Design a protein around this nucleic acid. Structure first.
Ligand code: CL
Ligand code: MG
Ligand code: MG
Ligand code: MG
Ligand code: MG
Ligand code: MG
Ligand code: MG
Ligand code: MG
Ligand code: MG
Ligand code: MG
Ligand code: MG
Ligand code: MG
Ligand code: MG
Ligand code: MG
Ligand code: MG
Ligand code: MG
Ligand code: MG
Ligand code: MG
Ligand code: NA
Ligand code: NA
Ligand code: NA
Ligand code: NA
Ligand code: NA
Ligand code: NA
Ligand code: SR
Ligand code: SR
Ligand code: SR
Ligand code: SR
Ligand code: SR
Ligand code: SR
Ligand code: SR
Ligand code: SR
Ligand code: SR
Ligand code: SR
Ligand code: SR
Ligand code: SR
Ligand code: SR
Ligand code: SR
Ligand code: SR
Ligand code: SR
Ligand code: SR
Ligand code: SR
Ligand code: SR
Ligand code: SR
Ligand code: SR
Ligand code: SR
Ligand code: SR
Ligand code: SR
Ligand code: SR
Ligand code: SR
Ligand code: SR
Ligand code: SR
Ligand code: SR
Ligand code: SR
Ligand code: SR
Ligand code: SR
Lengths: 46, 56, 143
RNA sequence: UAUGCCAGCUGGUGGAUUGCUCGGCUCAGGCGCUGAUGAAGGACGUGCCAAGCUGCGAUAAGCCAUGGGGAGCCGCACGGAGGCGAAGAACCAUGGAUUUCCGAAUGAGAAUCUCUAACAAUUGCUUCGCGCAAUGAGGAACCCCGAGAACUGAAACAUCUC
RNA sequence: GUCUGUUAGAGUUGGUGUCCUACAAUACCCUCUCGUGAUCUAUGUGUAGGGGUGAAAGGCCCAUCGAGUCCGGCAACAGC
RNA sequence: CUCUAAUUGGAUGGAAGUAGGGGUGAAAACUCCUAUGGACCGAUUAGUGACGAAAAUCCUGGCCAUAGUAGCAGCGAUAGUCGGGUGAGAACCCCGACGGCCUAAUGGAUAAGGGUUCCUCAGCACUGCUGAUCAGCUGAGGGUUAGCCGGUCCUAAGUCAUACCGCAACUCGACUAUGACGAAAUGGGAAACGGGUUAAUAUUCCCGUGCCACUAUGCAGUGAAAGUUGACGCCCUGGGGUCGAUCACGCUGGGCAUCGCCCAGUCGAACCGUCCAACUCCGUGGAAGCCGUAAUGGCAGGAAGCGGACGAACGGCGGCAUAGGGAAACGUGAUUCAACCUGGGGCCCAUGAAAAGACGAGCAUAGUGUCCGUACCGAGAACCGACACAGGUGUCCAUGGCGGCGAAAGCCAAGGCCUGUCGGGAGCAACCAACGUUAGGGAAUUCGGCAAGUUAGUCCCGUACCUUCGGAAGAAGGGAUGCCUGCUCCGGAACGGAGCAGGUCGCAGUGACUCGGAAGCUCGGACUGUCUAGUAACAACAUAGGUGACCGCAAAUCCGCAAG
RNA sequence: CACUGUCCCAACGUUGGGCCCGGUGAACUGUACAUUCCAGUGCGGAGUCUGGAGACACCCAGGGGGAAGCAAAGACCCUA
RNA sequence: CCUAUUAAAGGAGGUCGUGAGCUGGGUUUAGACCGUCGUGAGACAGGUCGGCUGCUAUCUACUGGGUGUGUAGGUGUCU
RNA sequence: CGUACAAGACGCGGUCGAUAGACUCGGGGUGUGCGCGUCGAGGUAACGAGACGUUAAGCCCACGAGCACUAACAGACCAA
């Protein structure tokens, strides 16, 4: 498929959004990314 | 040819997409109409009283 | 050690099918340390990395058979698999023959051997399939 | 006496129970419109490290003023580094600044982008020029004006009833 | 709208074979039928629910069809 | 049992709860002791109730037996083994050897769709039909570069917006105007090739070379819009012609070693220039039977011949190229010829798009050429099917070698793979799946020859009833078939085809593979075609043919509430 | 007509399972009890009642006689 | 019912034994035709072509094979 | 190692020994090897299907015998 500039920004965001919760946030909160996604098992919008 | 699995393989058409107006993946790019907020069909926002119980 | 990456890079530098690059069994360590295409070429130069030769089917046996058949052998009833019209296209064969007859008649006319009307008479006879071949035509011409 | 039955003991598994309540549910009083000066909503950004939430908008967890407040502070969030604060910070009230794109969405088009000056469209006034104005869309229900079922009850059913 | 043909491709007569907590909510194998035409096929496009579409089987309209799906009427009514 | 009130009590010198145990009550239940627990808990009276469960194929959660059981075998893709590397650990991660598997695909490039799955490093708790040091998994970084490839522009079926009108009304509705929208492989379309480079991009970066458009300036030019192009169906076919493949000989390199054979290479684009066959036409000529084709056909309305104008390739030739590429040589001829080019014929109750644009319409030099897409997969693990699913899923590579009619089988290259991913043992029993072979009999089996088998390619001889004269028909039936030596014929020739004479081996010569069993009678539907996606493919539906009905168009029939 | 393991009547063999071992590792089903058998009885179709008979426990493999086996609140029939 | 053999080619019960054994020809869904009946939908105690057969055995039962306990160190032969 | 066998079980031998394998004989299955020589229709020659000889040959054996060469070693344990 072909992606428009906007569709790319969105996919781009969904990629960055798919990260680990910073090691330090777990300390600061004295002990999970509930939105963690997988390209194969999940399905993004559009 | 079965209507089940065999016929699912043919599905790679894109219809519903992210809607510029409400953000829901309901903008039917072939109809150019958001089945969610009715963008592209109604200037007003798509509402319906049946979307909730009658006394609520 | 895992040399998969290098195998891929070497297949591109030696430019051959991945399945033809040879890595010296006693130099994995060095090949393992190869990171860049430059490292690979260097190793190619040393000979630690090489490309085996591609194969080419022998046509020697086919050639022998090709001769026997050109000589008219090995084409008996027991060797034919296709219908006669398939082994020789009839319309094609006719194009072959009739052109050879018309040419013949053309040379015999500009050569003065045949008058215009004699040529015409034979030409139309030829076009009507009166002659089996060029030799058959000449036989006829000799009255 | 093996395999094993019933009950208990010690330890698991499990998360009932008891205790606790940052959330609900209901009632009562008060108050009550927003939007072309582009709303509500959404997208995408935005932090030293930043995924979620919250906030904010290229001045981007903020900028300015007045008053309050006060030796502390840098949100949720108890980390590390570093910084700010007696030039009175944080924080609170009021007022102001900034306020990307899509969005009634209004120059034309478009799955939040693009293309070459724009009240698009419908109106009123009219210096008959978009010059001055209006409408559009949102809102928990309430309210006004129109369109208007059936299941159901009648122990069936058609008027009637719902 | 010819013939043969596992050319591509379309289909599916029989095995009532294999499978039947399957590889698969319609699959596998062999045999079989079509294969220049009313042919097959990709994408785009149109027709919408008492309505479509149907060389007609009540066939098909997203595993759903003698009236799709979703939510609402709704906590329908029942002497079972 | 909950909570409220009044009265009145207990608790860190240990409340509630829970576990085990003692006592009371017919009983619902009350109470004490010990352990645990670590902060709340009662009684009486009057109230308050979302107040008591063994049951509803009741609900939610948790858990056992089932069971160390089924599956991890079956698909025409049976795939591994011996050494070694790395590692704490190796059947399955990597190297080598040996052995295999895939050939319209298991190889190459892509559309949709996915969305980072791509590259690197570091890992193995998770994911993976076993293991794992591996990975589409985890952590951290990195990666997609365009005037000339798409988009963008054009219009297609058709869509929407505005206006107009309808509607009680609208987010609804048909027409008519206007505008816009509508084609990323696969409609039209200004222009790019070759090489080098990276871990991952690449006609995009780099090197070399080239081209197009617009604009500016200069020269030329007054022509400029008539016309041509874009721009087109199905069937048969001739000619030109490249890649490929093959044949001949030479050069470079490799292999094998009783022979003297076998393999690979021998390269080189866009672009610029130039050549032109066919079609059309003109001059000449003067055929009253000649010219021409594979075929049709052509001609005194002027044939052949001769000369001429116009005029083709993604093709030839020269440049491009003391560019590039190659270790080296760095060929020349030929045949058959995909692509591409250009003709001829036939067919239609069927007639095979439009628009933008281009040409028409010169040359120099310069400047400008923005914006968006660009990774990877594209599948027996990256898409859809809940899965790393034996299903489904578009395009092109249809010309690699032998084979043969062949884009068939079978075998083998280039390329890919051992991941249609658990293994180890037992001459490895019974039983099952899928197969091979079975003496004599030969359908006795069975509803039924179901299943299996028989036949089979090609050539020659030969071929009944019936018939719509097409057919039936490959009817049936019979014969041949290899190899070797030397030849004949057709053709320009083939590494094309058809035969002859002699020799000769086997049980068997279409030796495998490929590859019809045949005949008769009756019923039905004329035929090709359609259908119950998923138990029915048929005699059912369709069909041409036949017939009846309505209607002269301000019609008949039909949709809408209306505008239509 | 031809041919043949369809059959008389079965045999031998091949490949993959099956069996043993490492690893992985479900589901169906479960009121309870349960070593049964022959009779009888009982709502007339009993592992569980009665009377006898038999029965030392546990495990492996097997083909499936019974559990009116498991699966789906019978679709036939009647009734509303 | 019929034929040839035969000593004879008896009848019946076992959920009209036997589909977690087979088959699927008949019966008896959904398709279709004919006759008859019906205004019609459609029907038929008529005929006809086509039309599906799930499950890894827990218990019990039996066929075979083992490990234990009892009788109470061993080998061999018996009853 | 098999006179036995799906696990288990059963049977035999273990140097005081022919239990299994190697080797050699025997007994068997095929049917006359590679190479060389002669012949061979022909062909200038090259070449040549094939024939004869060497060859009762070559290849092969789930059987027997001989034979301690190799391996049944070394050795651990229960036990009134
Ligand atoms: Cl022609
Ligand atoms: Mg002909
Ligand atoms: Mg009623
Ligand atoms: Mg009191
Ligand atoms: Mg309760
Ligand atoms: Mg079991
Ligand atoms: Mg690449
Ligand atoms: Mg797989
Ligand atoms: Mg019989
Ligand atoms: Mg000749
Ligand atoms: Mg009859
Ligand atoms: Mg028919
Ligand atoms: Mg069907
Ligand atoms: Mg008709
Ligand atoms: Mg019975
Ligand atoms: Mg039974
Ligand atoms: Mg059954
Ligand atoms: Mg079963
Ligand atoms: Na996805
Ligand atoms: Na208020
Ligand atoms: Na105005
Ligand atoms: Na594996
Ligand atoms: Na070929
Ligand atoms: Na019964
Ligand atoms: Sr998926
Ligand atoms: Sr599709
Ligand atoms: Sr609209
Ligand atoms: Sr509404
Ligand atoms: Sr045909
Ligand atoms: Sr069938
Ligand atoms: Sr079969
Ligand atoms: Sr099935
Ligand atoms: Sr055919
Ligand atoms: Sr409801
Ligand atoms: Sr209750
Ligand atoms: Sr369990
Ligand atoms: Sr396997
Ligand atoms: Sr299978
Ligand atoms: Sr580990
Ligand atoms: Sr990878
Ligand atoms: Sr457009
Ligand atoms: Sr195109
Ligand atoms: Sr075509
Ligand atoms: Sr040609
Ligand atoms: Sr690419
Ligand atoms: Sr596939
Ligand atoms: Sr290969
Ligand atoms: Sr694996
Ligand atoms: Sr044999
Ligand atoms: Sr018979
Ligand atoms: Sr019979
Ligand atoms: Sr014959
Ligand atoms: Sr169909
Ligand atoms: Sr069994
Ligand atoms: Sr039947
Ligand atoms: Sr005892």
């Amino acid at each position: 498929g072909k992606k428009s500039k906007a569709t790319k920004k969105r996919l781009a965001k969904l990629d960055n959004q798919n990260s680990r919760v910073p090691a330090w946030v777990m300390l600061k909160t004295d002990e999970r990314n509930h939105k963690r996604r997988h390209w194969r098992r999940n399905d993004t919008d559009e | 040819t079965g209507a089940g699995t065999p016929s699912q393989g043919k599905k790679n058409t894109t219809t519903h997409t992210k809607c510029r107006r409400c953000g829901e993946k309901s903008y039917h790019t072939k109809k150019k109409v958001c089945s969610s907020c009715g963008f592209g069909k109604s200037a007003k926002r798509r509402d319906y009283e049946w979307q909730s119980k009658a006394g609520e | 050690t895992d040399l998969s990456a290098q195998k891929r890079l070497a297949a591109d530098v030696l430019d051959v099918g991945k399945n033809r690059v040879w890595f010296n069994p006693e130099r994995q360590g060095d090949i393992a340390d190869a990171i860049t295409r430059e490292d690979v070429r260097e190793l190619v130069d040393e000979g630690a990395i090489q490309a085996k030769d591609k194969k080419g089917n022998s046509r020697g046996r086919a050639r022998e058979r090709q001769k026997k058949r050109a000589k008219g052998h090995q084409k008996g009833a027991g060797s034919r698999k296709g219908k006669a019209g398939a082994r020789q296209n009839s319309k094609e064969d006719w194009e072959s023959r009739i052109r050879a007859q018309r040419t013949k008649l053309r040379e015999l006319r500009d050569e003065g051997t045949l008058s215009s009307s004699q040529y015409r008479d034979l030409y139309d006879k030829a076009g009507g399939g009166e002659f089996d071949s060029v030799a058959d035509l000449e036989r006829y011409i000799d009255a």
